[PDB]
Amino acid sequence: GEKLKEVFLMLDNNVVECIKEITESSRNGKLVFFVGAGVSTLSDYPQWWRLVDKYHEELYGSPKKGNYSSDEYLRIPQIFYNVKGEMAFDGILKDFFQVDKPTNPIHDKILAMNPAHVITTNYDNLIDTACWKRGKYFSVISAEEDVANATSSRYLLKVHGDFRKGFKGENVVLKEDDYLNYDQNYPLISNLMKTIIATHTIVFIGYGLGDYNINMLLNWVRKLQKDSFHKPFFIRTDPSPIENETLIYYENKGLRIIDAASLIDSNEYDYLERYSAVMDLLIESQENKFITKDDEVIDYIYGKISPLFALQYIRKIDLKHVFEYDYHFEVNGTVVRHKNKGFGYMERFFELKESCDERSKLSKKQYERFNALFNFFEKNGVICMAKDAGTLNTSIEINSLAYHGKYDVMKKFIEEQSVSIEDDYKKAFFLACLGRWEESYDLYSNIILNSIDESNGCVYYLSQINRYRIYQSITQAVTQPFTDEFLARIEREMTNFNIDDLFNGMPFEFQKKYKILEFLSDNQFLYDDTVKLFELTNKVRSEMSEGSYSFGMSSDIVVLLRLYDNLRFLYENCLWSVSFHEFHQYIRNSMSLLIEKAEYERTRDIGFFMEYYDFVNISRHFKIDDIKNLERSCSIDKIRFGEQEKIEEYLVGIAEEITKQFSANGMNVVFYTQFISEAKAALYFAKYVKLSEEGLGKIVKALLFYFPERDLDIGKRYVWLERLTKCNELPKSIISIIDDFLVLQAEKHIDQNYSEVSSNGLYSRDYGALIKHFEKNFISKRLSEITLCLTQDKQKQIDFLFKLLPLLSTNAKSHLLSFKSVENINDLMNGIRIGLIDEFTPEHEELIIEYLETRKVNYIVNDYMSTFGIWYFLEEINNSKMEEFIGMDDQYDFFVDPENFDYKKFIPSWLKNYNDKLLGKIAGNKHMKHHVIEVLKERVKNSNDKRYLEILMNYFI
Amino acid sequence: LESKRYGEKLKEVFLMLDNNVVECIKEITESSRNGKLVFFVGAGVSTLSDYPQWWRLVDKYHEELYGSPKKGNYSSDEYLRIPQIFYNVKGEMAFDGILKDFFQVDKPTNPIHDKILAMNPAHVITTNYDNLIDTACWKRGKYFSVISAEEDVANATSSRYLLKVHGDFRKGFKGENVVLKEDDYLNYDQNYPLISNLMKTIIATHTIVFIGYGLGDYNINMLLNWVRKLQKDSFHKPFFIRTDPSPIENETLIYYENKGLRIIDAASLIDSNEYDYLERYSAVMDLLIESQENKFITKDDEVIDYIYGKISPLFALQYIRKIDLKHVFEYDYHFEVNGTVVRHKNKGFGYMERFFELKESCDERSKLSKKQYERFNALFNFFEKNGVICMAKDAGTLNTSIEINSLAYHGKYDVMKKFIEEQSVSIEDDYKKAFFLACLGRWEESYDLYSNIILNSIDESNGCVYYLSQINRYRIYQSITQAVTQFNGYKPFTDEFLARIEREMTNFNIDDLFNGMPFEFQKKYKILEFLSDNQFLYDDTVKLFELTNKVGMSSDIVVLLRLYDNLRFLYENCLWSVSFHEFHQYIRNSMSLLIEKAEYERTRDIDELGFFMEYYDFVNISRHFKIDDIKNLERSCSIDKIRFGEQEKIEEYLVGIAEEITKQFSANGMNVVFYTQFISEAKAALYFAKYVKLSEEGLGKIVKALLFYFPERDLDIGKRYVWLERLTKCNELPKSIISIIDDFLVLQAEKHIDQNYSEVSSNGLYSRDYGALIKHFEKNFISKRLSEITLCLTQDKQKQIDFLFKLLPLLSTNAKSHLLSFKSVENINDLMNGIRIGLIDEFTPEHEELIIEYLETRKVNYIVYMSTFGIWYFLEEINNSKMEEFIGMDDQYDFFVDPENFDYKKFIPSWLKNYNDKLLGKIAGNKHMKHHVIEVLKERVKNSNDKRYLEILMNYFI
Amino acid sequence: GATHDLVYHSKINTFVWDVEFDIVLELNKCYFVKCFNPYRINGDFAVSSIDIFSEGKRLLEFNFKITKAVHVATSKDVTEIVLHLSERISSPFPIVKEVVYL
C-alpha cells in the first residue's frame, strides 16, 4: 500500500486522471470491462496455438516450429474442416476444451470493481464460475436467441460463442469463415456490443496490441466522428515496456494505453502481479488518495458542495449525508470525527481557512473557489472542529416573510415584476401561503414548464413536491372556493402520480449531487430528530421523578437548536410541505418538553427566555386546548418573556389582519381557514406579554369587534378579554372599547329574537362586571340615554339593560325600575348578581319552594339547585322546608345535608369552582373536612393540576 | 355523459373484441407499467395539425423542374427521384429554399401528440422531421434527450430519448440535415451509424408499438427486413396500430402477422366516416390509456387470477403484516388487524368483495374451472393463515389470539441446539438454522452460513431469501461492530475474522440494497423496503401518539393487536433485525400504556373519582424492558391487583430461564456474545416474577438458580436480597426454600474461613438479612450446620466470628454460649448489630457514652449512623441531655433531636417512605412535625406518581 | 473546575460528583456511596446508609478531616468547593459518589 502510494506519487499525469475516470465510472455505472484471453490463460486453459499445432499434426504431420504468424492461426483449422471433416474437429475440441480449471484471483478482481457490463471474447466458463462465487447474477448472452430472452440488465456478453451447449465448432467462432461470416451469423450480439461501446467507458483488460478482435473494434471506431464516442482504455500487461511510437500511434487510432510494465519492475514470466499491479491500484474507489496537496482538497470540496449553491439553506443533519458517514455535524457548528480512516480534508480545510499564511499560497481560481466555499460554510452555521471551539454560537435566523406572518409585504412582492424563476418560485410560495392556490398551481406548473431550459433539479423537484402537497391541500379542502373546471384538471393530471416514484426516475445528477432531497417526498424527514427526542423525553422525565437537579449542563440546547433547523430548511427554500401533522406533534412535544423543563428547573433550591421564535411555533402549531394543558400543569406566568416589542408587533400584525380582512369584504375561504386558527391560538397565549396602550387597544378592538362569529362566541370572548385585561390594566381606553361594545350589543336587542348564542353561559353582563371590577365609579352615558328613552314595550332590551343595571345613572335606574321587579328565579339570580337585593324577604324563599317543587316534578318521573343549597349553607335561606329535596343532586345534597351524603359520590372537582367564603366554611366543618381532604389528596395524586394543592394548603391544612 | 356514453359504450366495445385485442391491451399497458413500452411515432399523427406533406413538395419539385404537374397519381420510389434529379440538375440553393418555404411553419399540436405522452413511454422514436412532438413534450413538463444527429448519443443528458431517426430542421432548413433524397436512404447506414444501432437495440430489448404508419411505408419495410434476419423469436413481435378508413383484408392480416407485425386495426373496432382520423387514433388511444381501470375482471375466473397475480409470489414468506397488505394492493382496502376489511377509495370492482362471495358460499365455488379451483385453494389457505377473514359489514365475530410460533421468540433454546445439529435439506432450512445460530450467539457460523445463503440463492429465483439474508448479515455486522466496540475496541472473535468482515461490509450502503435489484424485486415484494431503514414502525408509532393523548368500547385492542403483528413478521420470517432500540421504546410505551390503562380502569365505581396478561404479555416485558423501567411501573401502577393467567406457561418460561442459567454457569458454558444478550433477559425476566404463583418445584428451581448459579459482577450478594424477597413474598417457604437459603448461608460461612473476603455489595444488604428472612417465616429455625461451624470455632478467624454474629439468632444454645465466649460490645457496629439481631433489651449507660465518643468524632468531622441515634433519642431509648449538642450536622438528626428549631424547608421530600410504624405515628403524635410533614406529604403527593406518600398521609396523619 | 458533572440528588440532600478524598479517619483515595432503601427489613432507623470505600470497604472511630479532594480525570484538587458545599449542606457526607435509589 504505502510503496504503492510511492507508486501513486511516481506516475505521469495521465495515469492518475485515468484512475479518476475509471473509478468514477465504476461509481456512476458507466464502467464496462472487456475481458480477454490473457486473464483466462492464467489458471491455464488450453491455448489456441496448442490446438492449431494439433490441427497441423493430424493433417500434415511433422509439426512446423517455424513460429506461427498471423491468419495461419485460422486456415489450419479451416483446411482441416474442408478435408478431414467436422466429427474430427469437434472431437479435438472435446479433448482439449473439456477441462475444469479453477479460477485465478484476477477473474475476481474484475468483479470486485462492480462493472456495469462484462463483455468477453473467451470461449470458456471461468468468468461465470467466478461470478457464481461472489453472488452476482449476469445474463449470459452467448448465442443470438438470448437478447430479448435475457432476464437481467447485467450482461455477460460472450461475443465469440460458448461451449455450454456442446463442444462443437458451430457454437463458437474458431474457423476462418466464422470470422468472415460473423456480422451475418451474429446480428444482435454485435449491435448490442457496439451500442455499449459508444454509450459507456470501455476498459480492455486481457489483450495485446495485435489481437485481431481489438483491430475489429478499431476499424469500426475509426469510421466514427470528431469524438462522438469516448476513447477506449487499454490496460497493457506485458513483460517488455511499450515503445513510445506505438504509444503515440494507438493513442490517435483510438486507444489510451495504461501500461503495466512502466509502473512496476519485475520478471519475464509473472503476469499475475502486473494484472494485480493495475487492479489493486484501480480498486481504490473508497480510498481516493488524490488530495495530498492544498489545491486538491479545495477541489474535492468544490466537487461535493458547489452544486448546492442553488439551495438557500441545508440542514446539518443532512450534511452528514452529503459527505458519506464521517463528520457528524452538531447543530452548534462543532464537527466531530466519526470513522474517517484517512485524510482530514475538513480538518485541512479549516487550517487553510482562518490562518491566512496557508491561504496566500493557493492558485488563482482555487482562491475564488475557496471564497465561495467560505461563504457557503459560513452561511449555514459551520464554523470549526470540536477541539479548539468553546464559543459555540446561537440565534439562528429564519428570515422569510412567510414565517414571520408578515403578509403586508408578500402582497406587495407578488404584484412586482418577475425577473427570474427563483423569483417566481418565491412568488408562487407566497401565493400558496396567502391562500391563492389557483395562481399557485398555475405558477408552479409554469415553474415545472420553465425549469426545462435551465439545468436545476432542485427547482423542478421541489416545485413538484409543493404542487403535490398543494394538491393534497385542495383535496383535503374540498372534502370539507374553486370552480368545477379547476377540480377536473387537477384531478386529471395528479392521478397516478406516485410521490415515491418522483425521486427514482431522475437523471443521475439528481441522484447523488442532491441526495438529501429524498426525505421530503415521504415523512422520513423528521425521523432522526424524533428518535432523538424520545430518549431526551426519558432523560429529563426520569430525573424529574427523583429530583436530580443537574447543576451542570442542560440538554434543552439539543432540542431547541434542532427544531430550528427543521423550520429553516422548509421556509428558506420555499417549500409548501408544511401541511402535515407530524411536524405539529413534534413541535408540540418539543416545546411542551422545553416549558416543563424550564418550569421544573426554576423552583430548585439546591435558559429558554422565550424570545420571538418561541411564540410563533406555539401560535401556529398548537391548539387552545393544548395551551390549556400547559397552563393546567406548568405555570407559564413565572416565565420572563423577552422581545416584547417583537411579539407585540406580531400580535398587532394578527390584529390588523383580522381588521383588514373582516371590515367590508376580504375573506377567501381557503385563506380564512388557515389564518383563523393561527389568530385563535396566537391570541390565547397573549396574556404573557406586557402590551402598550396602543398594543392592547388594537388587539382588544380587533377581538371584540372584528373577530367574526361562528368561531368566537359572545361569551367565548369573555375568557380572552379577561386574560388580556388581567395582565395589563385598563387605561380608560379599554373601558371605552368595552363600553362601546356594550352599547353596540344594546342596540342589537331593539328587535326581537336576538338571543346572543353562547356556549359558556357568559354574556354581556360579565363585560359590565369587569368594567365595574376595575372602574368602580363608571357611568356609561350612552346606556343611560338608551334606558332614559325606554318605553313600555321592547321586553328584550329591558332585560338586557337589567343584566347591565349597575352601569346606569340614578334617573336611568328609576325610570328603568319603573318597569321591572322580581317575579321569578332568573330576575332573582340576576338580582343578587348585580347586587340589588341585600336580604331575602320570605316570598323569595317560597318562590324557590315552588321552583324546587317543579324540580320534584322532574324527579318523580341550566341547573339552579346547587345555588339554593349553598344559600341554605351560608345561612342566607331561613327555612326548614328546603331539606326535603334529597336524592336529586349530589351537590345540593352535599350542602343541605352534610352528614348523610355518601362521600364517594363526591366529584373530584367542585372545589376549583368555589369562592373563598365557601371554601372556608367547608373547611369549618367536620365531615366535609374529613372527606373533602381525602378527595383533594387522591386528586392531588391523579392530576397534574396545581390548583387542588392550593385549595388543600390555603384552606384545609 | 361522455364518461357514461363513450366509456360505457366503450365497455360494450371492451366486450365486443376478439381475444387478441384484449391481451394486446394487457401487454401494452403492463409494458407501460414496467417501462418496456416504446412508441414509434409516425407521420400520420403529425399530418393532423396539418404539416406540409411530402407529395405536395415532390409536386413542386416536379413543377420547377419539368413544369406541367403530373396528375398520374404518384407511385413508389418516384417520391424520392424527383427530389434527386432536382438536386443533380437545379442544385442545393433551390432545394433548401423550397424546404425553407414549406417546412418553416408553426402548426400547434393536436391532442393525439399528447395522448402518446399520457401513456408514460420508456422511449419515443420518431421518423418525423418537424418539431411538434417536443413542443407537445414541452407542455406536459417532460424532458427528452432529443437525439437527432450523430453527435448527440453520448452527448445525451437523460436516459429518455426522443430519437428523431430521419434527421431534423432545428439547425437550419437544409437538405443535408435530414433524409429526404434517394441517396440519403441508400447512404443511411454509413452516414448514420450510432442512431441506427441505438434504434435497433431498443427494438430487440423492448416492446415496440407503431402509432403513425401504413402497411406500405418503406421505413416499416426497412424494419421488417432486419427483423426477418433474426431467429426463432429471439425478439418480441412489434405491434402495429392501423388507423385507416377501410378495414383490413384478412390475407394482409395473416401475411404481416408472420412477417413480424401484430396488427391492431382501428376500423374493425368502431364505425365512422372516411375523412376522420382523429377519433380512430382516439379510439385506440382512449382504450389503451386505461392502465388504472383494468376492467378485465368482470368474470368469476378473472378476479381469481388477478389475486393470483398480486399474491402468489408471496408464498415464500411465512407471514405478512396487514399494515403492509394495504400497500400490497394499492391504496384501497385498509386491512384492520382484526380481519375486517374496510373500503377506502375503490372506484370500481370489489374484487375482494367478489372473492369472499366466491369464498364461503360454495354454490359459486363449484362453477369455477379446474386450475382456477386449485388457485382458489392456495389463496384461501393464504388469506386464512394471515388472519384475513371477511369484510366489515357482515362480521361481528372478530377473533383474537395470534400465535408467534417460533422457537426463537419463546426462548426455547433447548431445541434450537437440537435443530441445528440435524441434516439440512433446503435453503429455507439453512435460513432457519442460520437465524438460530445468530440467536444463540454463534455469530461466526451465522455470518458464514448467511454468506452461504447469499451464495446459494443465486441458482434459485427467490428475492426474499437473498434480500432478507442480506439485511440480517448487515445487522449482524452492526452487532459485531457494536460488540467489539465494547469488547476490544474476553476474545469473542479472532483477528482474522474482524478483518474480512470489515473488508466486505465496507461501502455496502443499506439504502442502495433495495434500488439495485431486478424489477421482480421492485413491485412483487414492494413491502420489503421498510426494513433496510427504520421506517418499519412508523405508522404504528404515529398511531400510538394519538392514543397516548386519547387515553363502552376500550381502545386497548388497537395497541395490543398491532404490536403483535410487528413481533410476528420478524420472528416468523427469521429476521435478525431485532437489535435496534426503537422497537424497544415502542414496546415499553405500548405495554406501559396498556398497564396504566388497565389499572386506571379498575377502581372505577361508576360515578367515578381486558388485558388478562397471558404468556405473550410477559416475554415482551422481560426481553425489552429494564429493571428500572419495571420499577417505574411498580411505583405508579399497582400490578399486584392484576390477575395474571397462563401461570403454567409463564412458569415454564421462567424455569426455562432458570435452567439456562443452571446449564451455562455450572462448569463451562459462557460465550461472551451470548452471555451479554441472555443475561439481560434473565435479569429483567426474574424481577417481574413476583406476579406469578409458582409451585414448589417452580419456585425451588428459580431460587436455587438465583442464589447459587446466577453469576457475580451482574448480581451482587445484597442485590439478590430484593429479588429473593419478592419471590418469597408472593409465595410461602415450604421447608424447601428454607433449605435453599440455609444452604446458601452455610456456603457463605465457609467462604469466610480465609481473610480478605468481604462480600462486595452496593445496597449494604448482606447475609444477615437472609438470616432475618429465615427467622421471618420460620421463627423456630435452628441451622444444624451453622451450629456445628460455631461449635468448632477457635480463638482466631475473626472474620468468620463476625459473620456468625450477624447470623447469631440462627444458632443453638451451646453454639451461642461458645460463640459469645469470644465477642462482646466494644464499638458502634457490634451495638447496631446487637439490636438488629435482638440481644440487647435495654441500654446500659456505657453504650450511650460510647455513642457520645462516636458523635464526638463526628464533631471532628464537622469542625473541618447519626440518624439512628437521633431517632433512638426520639423514641425515648437514649436517656441523655448531652446528645442535643450536635446541631447543624445532619438534617435528619436535627429533625429528631430538635423538632422545633429544624427549618422545615430543609425537610427532604423523602424520609417518610423509610420509616416504620412506630416512628410514623410518633411523628404524627407531635405538633410541628404534623404541621410541616403534612405539607411536605401534600406537595409531594402533587409532584409524584408514587402511591406510597398517599398511604402515609392517609393511614397515619389524617 | 468540574461543576459540569456536579449533580444534586434532592431526596437525600447530596451532591453526586466523582471526587477521591484523602482523609484522617490517615487514609488515601476514599469515596462514598449512599443507599435509599425504603423498607429495609431489620437493617436502627434511617434512610441512608453510608458505605465508605478505600478501594474496598473500610470495615469501621470516625474522623475524616478531608485534606486532599481531587476530581477524577480533570484533576488539580477541588478541595475549596468541597468545603464550600460542606459549609452549606448539613448532612452526613454531602459529597457522595453514587446513589443506589432502592
Author numbering:
A (entry chain A): 12 to 491, 506 to 631, 644 to 898, 910 to 1005
B (entry chain B): 6 to 494, 504 to 565, 577 to 634, 644 to 898, 912 to 1005
C (entry chain C): 9 to 33, 38 to 55, 58 to 74, 78 to 119
Question: Could you share sentences copied from the article?
Answer:
DSR2, a Sir2 domain-containing protein, protects bacteria from phage infection by hydrolyzing NAD+. The protomer structure of DSR2 revealed an architecture that consists of an N-terminal Sir2 domain (residues 1–298) and a long C-terminal helical region (residues 299–1005). The Sir2 domains of two side-by-side DSR2 dimers contact each other to assemble into a head-to-head rod-shaped homo-tetramer of DSR2.
However, the resolution of DSAD1 and its binding region in DSR2 is relatively low, posing challenges for model building. By employing local refinement focused solely on the DSR2-DSAD1 interaction region, the resolution for this specific area was improved to 3.2 Å. The sidechains of the majority of DSAD1 residues were distinctly visible, enabling successful de novo construction of the atomic model for DSAD1 and the entire DSR2-DSAD1 complex. The DSAD1 structure comprises one α-helix and eight β-strands, forming three intertwined β sheets, which deviates significantly from the initially predicted AlphaFold2 model. The aromatic sidechain of F59 from DSAD1 inserts into a hydrophobic pocket constituted by the sidechains of I918, W919, L922 and L966 from DSR2. The side chain of N21 from the DSAD1 establishes two hydrogen bonds with the nearby sidechains of S957 and K960 from DSR2.
